[PDB]
């Protein structure tokens, strides 16, 4: 049907912000997903401060 504007959401898992979901911002992608949204630890949100997104990190490929 008629389209207005093309936009996206956080987690690569197609899910908007939910104060029940905790995120981590793609250091290189600049976006967020639920820790598990990308298969990461839970506390990974706190014990973290150098996390990168898998969508962006993919380019870094270590």
């Amino acid at each position: 049907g008629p389209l207005g504007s093309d936009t996206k959401l956080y987690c690569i898992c197609k899910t908007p912000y939910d104060e029940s979901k905790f995120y981590i911002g793609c250091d290189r992608c600049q976006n967020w997903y639920h820790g598990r949204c990308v298969g990461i630890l839970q506390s990974e949100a706190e014990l973290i401060d150098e996390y990168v997104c898998p969508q962006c990190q993919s380019t870094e490929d270590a």
């Binding site: 104060e19 995120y23 911002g25 600049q30 967020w32 949100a45 706190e46 973290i48 996390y51």
Partner: peptide, 15 residues
């Protein structure tokens, strides 16, 4: 990193 988390449960400890 740009960790995006929440802490609504916490109020604010003086220390």
């Amino acid at each position: 990193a740009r960790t995006k988390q929440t802490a609504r449960k916490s109020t604010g400890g003086k220390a």
